[PDB]
Write a protein that binds this DNA or RNA. Structure first.
Ligand SMILES: [K+]
Ligand SMILES: [K+]
Ligand SMILES: [K+]
Ligand SMILES: [K+]
Ligand SMILES: [K+]
Ligand SMILES: [K+]
Ligand SMILES: [Mg+2]
Ligand SMILES: [Mg+2]
Ligand SMILES: [Mg+2]
Ligand SMILES: [Mg+2]
Ligand SMILES: [Mg+2]
Ligand SMILES: [Mg+2]
Ligand SMILES: [Mg+2]
Ligand SMILES: [Mg+2]
Ligand SMILES: [Mg+2]
Ligand SMILES: [Mg+2]
Ligand SMILES: [Mg+2]
Ligand SMILES: [Mg+2]
Ligand SMILES: [Mg+2]
Ligand SMILES: [Mg+2]
Ligand SMILES: [Mg+2]
Ligand SMILES: [Mg+2]
Ligand SMILES: [Mg+2]
Lengths: 300, 101, 59, 35, 237, 92, 257, 196
RNA sequence: AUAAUAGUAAAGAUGAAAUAAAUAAUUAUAAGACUAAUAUAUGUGAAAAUAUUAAUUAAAUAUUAACUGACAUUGAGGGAUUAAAACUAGAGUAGCGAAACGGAUUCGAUACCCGUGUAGUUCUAGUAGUAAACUAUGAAUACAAUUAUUUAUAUAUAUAUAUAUAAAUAAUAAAUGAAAAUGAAAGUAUUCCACCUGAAGAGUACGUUAGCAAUAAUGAAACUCAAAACAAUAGACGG
């Protein structure tokens, strides 16, 4: 049918997005899907959208929100520049590593309840992870849940007197433990936030596995040298490290001992010059940012 | 001169991604144009769900929605819903009558 | 800086408006018209921004 | 927990089980089990 | 705008010209239009089913069909106010098409933000030629991307290999990671192998960015200097 | 949530006096600096020598220099061209 | 989707291979299997991208200057090179399937033998073939390609490539193996090439090269191992150069009529 | 966009998706086939077919469609009055006499024959929302018309509507090509019956 | 307004003027009236009206459950409420301010501007029932094509949006209309009430009823005339 075809159409494949096309806050990762048109189609203003893109657009990459609007225009920005940030990261050949030494999210590991010993930490995270929830929809998590949990009273009024009667007659320090486990055991079958929207690992920035060496005609490369730019002429206030602009990413540059004298000389125009840096490590934070650490390799 | 006004230079945060356009003057102007106090909601008690009328005895919180002379700010400036603006104004007027604001 | 406070609290305007008495009906008419002009200007600026955005994208 | 709760501020479950011979018919049941 | 009458009746108005004799010669279109009548009803048509999800439109559940108690513990014994409002408008409003895959697509790109940075071509080639066997993720003719994961997830739930959508989705995600890792290595190794055989490249991606940033930073230098001199004069006032 | 205000149908969309960025005259800024230089270091002070030399060259032929920055705004051309498309008016 | 081109007299090729060079099994590996292997990988690499609508020769030129697209370049170069090799070693380019033609006597043309003498200091074609066999054995340790190429100066010269090295674009000829040791003369050639690539003003850092292949010999294991075996690649190159289809090779030399 | 919906097109809508209305292609195909047969009939009958489209990029499709149907096209601007005021606009331009094979007879035309209105037998409009003038003139002149009708376009203004996207050059050129080939087949069948 | 304090010689007003130990400043005391921002009269109220605070009493919303079982709509007569001004008593009286008396302006100025400023404006208890008391649009019911924007209720979740159903407002299709325009009515229909029948005379005269009174309600005819009126069009003119 036509409905089946539409669901699989290339336009349906693009997930709905209404995030501001002009965002002036902090950008940590791509927010819009880049659309590309071939040179032949660009010559005919064809992008596979509803309407022809104006001929003024010469780029072959754009990002859009709405196919059509009440203003009879498409809401789009003729830019595709987050792809070059990803490809420049690939050229730096620095694998992303976990600063906490967690399991690789891209491998199906056999995990155990080592961290599940915090059942009361995360079972209540469902009601306590409400930082940005409505004052009454979050309050609907109190009566709606209470009825659901109150429907298991009979089950827990028998299991507890059949598996741990001593605690019911001595102390509730262990009873509270049996309660947290009970609900989780009766909730694992349930589906509360069964889909987790948190970023998985690198989020797709890099699929490179650590360990491989870079062979070169001049021998194996031991230190990666990448051109960059120093943004500030004074270390980040309250931090012992300056900031550099390397390959579309802002890194923290650590200097060997002293800061090169071109800093004082150039002043606030220091960004006008290119320096060579060494990328020590790259980490991924939960916000979805990349923590790139560099070192200002100076001619010596 | 080795110095530039802060208004003529953009400081790229740490951990963020950038494009060559971020070093241009257009970025400076674009950041000024689209500079709105959108982070207020998370710091705005009255945009969180509390009833502004419960703060009639807390002049410090209420003093955040009046000018230097005590004039209640128009809803266009506070950004509150009609109900919260209505309740907030009542709270301030009651606070003034009690002798606290 | 002091002048900015006066203008942000409408001190000069209020003083002038208190020199002569205006009938309540006239006061209401003036308040209605002023609000309309304020709202009209906001709608005008919204349409100009769309024009500029449309021009930038080649429409 | 309901009737078999440890909270100082309990609910009507406890008062209902008392007047319904439940908190007593379970105390004896538990004690009988201990025997 | 009013339903026009004169555009669809050209044949009948022309026929009056010919019968009276005002028009001597029959127009060339006259016979063609007579054999192929225009559609002239221009009516609004009811619809009783959403083609996307098969939801039935125009069905009222009677109280006799709700014998059991509700979530509140109360029985339904009389129609409610909503049941007593005519719903003819729903028959004529274009149905909102919805798809389960849309929910998964949003999830995938929320979990993998950088997948958005991989350019997607919306221009179709020929939808009718797609002969895909979704037992495997890779397919000849289409790229490996988020859609590969979604279609794989649907095939798993359609074949009933997995029951929960989450489990099928997770299974597809790992297959996607494996294919993404094999490609990241083929490209790295291909570059390394070429340089070892004497391949030369003019400008690298990192170099391209530096040059573009220099062009912008040069214009920015001029303006800063100019605007740091007008301020000095204007402030001197 | 930010209140959108929609205008009624209008006979025109026009800016009464379009704002234009008028770059400052280079000779006038030079004169404003030289005049200030004389105010601090004194009139004819050797510190303002360069200012005097620059001012003379700027004004040598034309007292306001080669003014070639005249500009007119195109907002009214585009506003009238696009208004019917973007005003969101209902169909006829 | 990139599909394997249909070859003339394909039924004969699938039964008796290529007489005097490859057997039926040997030709199935080099063309019917390897060409399918390459085209499928190229489709997977390029599907969903603008490169899908371009022929392999155009793809290699477009991607020659992009370091991170080398995988696509390698696949495109191999596909184009393989059909250049399979085309000049083919019994007959015309499809004599219904004409049952068994008399194809193709010999070097007068323009080809005139350019050989001019560019090789009077050496005969037979001597040049010996130089080609020698160059392949001493310059291509592993996989690669042997080409007889013509440059913008009308001079025929011999080029050897390592793995998938294009003859059209000198920065990607891959004629020097840097895994082993290189002489100062080879380093000078590489240094001079790097300077030429740096003189280009284009933002893509691309140069103009008008070299064009005339003869292509596949030096990959997919072409000779099964029929000749490890170490017998010089006997394979000798047979290929002695049984070339000169209707194709002569047509590759520009005449100007 | 659903915000720009002209509810008179309700019967052509398949549904709404991503803030736009989806046109029912099952109806588009039936309307397209009906419209195509009309073009073929007029072409096979020797009528004048004019292709009107004034959106940027449409000229190439319009010129080829006219060439393969031996028709006419206008890509720049429809002069208001071209049909109702034809003598003041089109009288000066040259006419010619042709045989059943569409070959110029070369007969000189009397000044009487060179001033008479030459009215199109069929008008095809790619963008009817911007060509109200042409559509109204066709109605006044009793000229059957074909047009692509988008969700915001009035269907009743044309004899044979084709529901479909009128904003994409691919969609327009796809529909125009089908109509142009239909005309070509009619032209070839008329030239064939003359030979035999 | 008064008193004190130091400190002075002008102050106040206006288009410009002139009439009637100060002005200004810092304190203290007294009085009456009014209610800045918020603010949109949004909302609420039958209308008139209603925006400094609190309290008491009364009334007012949506959905759900149960119940009554047409108990409804409209409404002559009737009844109640009803801005401002006005009036009858008793308080109050700062500011404002008909009138009056003065100062100016002016050819004149029974005005516009200025001064002194009485009634009135305020409160309590009443009388009276009139306004461009207007949306110049009586009330009720059924129904008809869209968009946008808020509000409310409900639903869902991969939790903050999304999906629904109503209300309000804005712009419209159709329809209607003399058109201007109306737009869920000034549309399609139904039910009930009020009212109109050329202008002027006239909402006048007379009578009657009511009121302390001013007045309010009711409400003609003769004579005369072929006029009179509305929307819109193009002009001309505009201190
Ligand atoms: K109101
Ligand atoms: K009954
Ligand atoms: K009654
Ligand atoms: K009555
Ligand atoms: K008084
Ligand atoms: K009535
Ligand atoms: Mg359209
Ligand atoms: Mg005083
Ligand atoms: Mg107020
Ligand atoms: Mg209101
Ligand atoms: Mg009544
Ligand atoms: Mg009043
Ligand atoms: Mg009195
Ligand atoms: Mg007087
Ligand atoms: Mg006088
Ligand atoms: Mg007076
Ligand atoms: Mg009374
Ligand atoms: Mg009266
Ligand atoms: Mg009256
Ligand atoms: Mg009123
Ligand atoms: Mg009622
Ligand atoms: Mg009277
Ligand atoms: Mg009038």
């Amino acid at each position: 049918t036509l409905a089946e075809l539409l669901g699989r159409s290339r336009i349906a494949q693009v997930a709905n997005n209404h995030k501001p096309l002009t965002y002036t806050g902090k950008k940590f990762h791509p927010t819009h899907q880049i659309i590309e048109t071939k040179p032949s189609t660009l010559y005919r203003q064809e992008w596979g959208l509803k309407s022809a893109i104006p001929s003024k657009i010469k780029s072959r990459y754009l990002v859009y929100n709405d196919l059509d609007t009440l203003e009879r225009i498409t809401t789009f920005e003729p830019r595709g520049g987050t792809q070059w940030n990803r490809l420049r990261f690939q050229e730096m050949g620095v694998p992303i590593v976990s600063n906490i030494g967690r399991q690789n999210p891209f491998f199906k590991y056999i995990s155990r309840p080592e961290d599940e010993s915090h059942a009361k930490l995360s079972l209540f995270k469902e009601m306590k992870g409400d930082t940005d929830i409505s004052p009454a929809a979050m309050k609907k998590r109190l009566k709606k849940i209470t009825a659901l949990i109150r429907s298991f009273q009979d089950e827990f009024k028998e299991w507890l007197v059949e598996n741990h009667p001593d605690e019911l007659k001595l102390n509730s320090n262990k009873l509270e433990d049996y309660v947290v486990k009970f609900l989780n055991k009766k909730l694992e079958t349930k589906t509360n936030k069964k889909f987790n929207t948190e970023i998985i690992g690198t989020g797709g920035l890099s699929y490179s596995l650590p360990g491989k060496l870079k062979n070169s005609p001049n021998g194996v490369i031991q230190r990666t040298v990448v051109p960059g730019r120093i943004l500030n002429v004074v270390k980040e206030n309250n931090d012992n490290k300056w900031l550099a602009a390397i390959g579309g990413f802002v890194a923290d540059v650590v200097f060997f001992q002293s800061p090169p004298s071109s800093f004082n000389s150039m002043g606030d125009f220091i960004r006008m010059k290119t320096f060579l840096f060494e990328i020590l490590e790259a980490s991924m934070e939960k916000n979805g940012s990349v923590s790139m650490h560099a070192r200002l390799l100076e001619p010596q | 001169t080795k110095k530039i006004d802060q208004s003529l230079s953009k400081k790229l945060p740490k951990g963020t991604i950038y494009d060559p356009f971020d070093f241009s003057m257009g970025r400076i102007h674009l950041d000024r144009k689209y500079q709105a106090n959108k982070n207020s909601n998370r710091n705005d008690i009255m945009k969180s769900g509390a009833n502004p009328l419960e703060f009639y005895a807390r002049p410090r919180i209420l003093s955040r929605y009046v000018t230097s002379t005590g004039r209640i700010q128009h809803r266009d400036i506070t950004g509150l819903s009609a109900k919260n603006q209505r309740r907030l104004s009542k709270a301030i007027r009651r606070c003034q009558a009690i002798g606290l604001m | 800086r002091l002048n900015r406070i006066m203008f942000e609290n409408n001190i000069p305007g209020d003083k002038r408006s208190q020199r002569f008495y205006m009938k309540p009906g006239k006061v209401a008419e003036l308040k209605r018209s002023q609000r309309h002009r304020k709202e009209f200007m906001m709608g005008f600026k919204r349409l100009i921004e769309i024009v500029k955005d449309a021009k930038r994208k080649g429409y | 927990m309901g009737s078999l709760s440890n909270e100082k501020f309990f609910d009507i479950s406890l008062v209902d089980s008392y007047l319904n011979k439940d908190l007593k018919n379970i105390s004896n049941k538990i004690d009988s089990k201990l025997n | 705008m009013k339903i026009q009458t004169n555009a669809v009746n050209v044949l009948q108005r022309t026929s009056a010209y010919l019968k009276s004799g005002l028009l001597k010669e029959t127009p060339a279109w006259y016979n063609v239009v007579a054999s192929i009548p225009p559609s002239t009803k221009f009516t609004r048509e009811p619809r009783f089913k959403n083609p996307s999800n098969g939801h039935i439109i125009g069905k009222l559940v009677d109280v006799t069909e709700q014998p059991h108690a509700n979530n509140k513990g109360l029985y339904k014994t009389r129609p409610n106010s909503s049941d007593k409002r005519v719903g003819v408008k729903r028959l004529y409003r274009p149905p909102k098409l919805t798809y389960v895959e849309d929910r998964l697509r949003s999830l995938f790109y929320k979990q993998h933000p950088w997948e958005l940075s991989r350019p997607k071509i919306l221009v179709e080639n020929e939808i009718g030629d797609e002969n895909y066997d979704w037992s495997h993720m890779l397919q000849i003719g289409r790229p490996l991307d988020g859609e590969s994961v979604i279609q794989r997830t649907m095939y798993l739930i359609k074949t009933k290999q997995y029951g929960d959508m989450v489990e099928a989705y997770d299974h597809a995600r790992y297959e996607f990671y494996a294919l993404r890792m094999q490609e990241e290595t083929e490209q790295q190794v291909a570059l390394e192998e070429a340089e070892m055989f004497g391949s030369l490249f003019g400008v690298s991606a990192i170099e391209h960015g530096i040059q573009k940033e220099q062009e912008v930073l040069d214009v920015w230098e001029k303006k800063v200097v100019e605007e740091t001199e007008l301020m000095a004069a204007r402030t001197s006032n | 949530k930010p209140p959108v205000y929609r205008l009624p149908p209008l006979p025109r969309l026009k800016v009464k006096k379009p704002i234009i960025r008028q770059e400052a005259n280079k000779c006038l800024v030079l004169m404003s600096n030289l005049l200030q230089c004389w105010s601090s270091y004194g009139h004819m002070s050797p510190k303002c020598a360069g200012l005097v030399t620059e001012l003379k060259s700027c004004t040598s032929e034309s007292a306001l220099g080669k003014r070639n920055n005249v500009q007119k705004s195109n907002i009214n051309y585009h506003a009238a061209r696009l208004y019917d498309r973007i005003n969101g008016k209902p169909h006829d | 989707i990139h599909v394997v081109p249909k070859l003339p007299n394909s039924k004969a090729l699938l039964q008796n291979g290529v007489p005097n060079i490859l057997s039926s099994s040997g030709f199935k590996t080099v063309w019917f299997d390897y060409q399918r292997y390459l085209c499928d990988k190229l489709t997977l690499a390029t599907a969903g991208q603008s490169l899908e609508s371009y022929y392999p020769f155009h793809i290699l030129l477009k991607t020659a200057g992009n370091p991170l697209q080398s995988n696509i370049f390698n696949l495109a170069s191999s596909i184009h090179n393989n059909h250049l090799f399979v085309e000049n070693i083919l019994p007959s380019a015309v499809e004599h399937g219904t004409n049952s033609n068994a008399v194809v006597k193709t010999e070097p043309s007068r323009l080809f033998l005139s350019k050989i003498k001019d560019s090789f200091n009077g050496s005969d074609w037979e001597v040049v073939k010996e130089e080609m066999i020698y160059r392949a054995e001493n310059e291509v340790l592993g996989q690669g390609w042997l080409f007889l190429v013509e440059n913008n100066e009308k001079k025929l010269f011999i080029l050897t490539s390592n793995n998938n090295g294009t003859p059209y674009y000198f920065p990607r000829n891959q004629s020097f193996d840097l895994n082993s040791a290189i002489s100062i003369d080879e380093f000078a050639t590489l240094k001079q090439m790097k300077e030429l690539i740096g003189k280009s003003t284009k933002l893509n850092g691309k140069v103009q090269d008008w070299t064009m292949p005339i003869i292509c010999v596949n030096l990959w294991d997919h072409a000779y191992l099964h029929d000749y075996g490890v170490g017998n690649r010089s006997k394979y190159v000798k047979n290929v150069l002695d049984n070339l289809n000169w209707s194709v090779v002569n047509n590759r030399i520009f005449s100007g009529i | 966009s659903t915000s720009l919906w002209r509810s008179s097109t309700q019967s052509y809508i398949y549904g709404e998706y991503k803030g736009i209305h989806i046109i029912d292609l099952n109806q588009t195909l039936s309307y397209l086939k009906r419209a195509a047969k009309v073009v073929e009939g007029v072409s096979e009958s020797g009528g004048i077919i004019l292709f009107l489209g004034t959106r940027q990029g449409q000229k190439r499709g319009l010129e080829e469609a006219a060439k393969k149907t031996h028709g006419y096209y206008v890509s720049t601007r429809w002069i208001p009055g071209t049909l109702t005021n034809s003598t003041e606009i089109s009288g000066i331009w040259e006419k010619q006499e042709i045989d059943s094979n569409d070959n110029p007879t070369e007969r000189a035309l009397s000044p009487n024959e060179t001033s008479k209105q030459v009215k199109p037998d069929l008008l095809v409009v790619l963008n009817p929302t911007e060509n109200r003038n042409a559509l109204l003139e066709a109605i006044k002149s009793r000229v059957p018309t074909i047009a692509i009708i988008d969700t915001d376009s009035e269907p009743s203004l044309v004899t044979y509507p084709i529901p479909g996207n009128d904003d994409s050059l691919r969609s327009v050129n796809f529909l125009l090509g089908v109509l142009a080939r239909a005309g070509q087949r009619g032209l070839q069948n008329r030239l064939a019956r003359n030979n035999e």
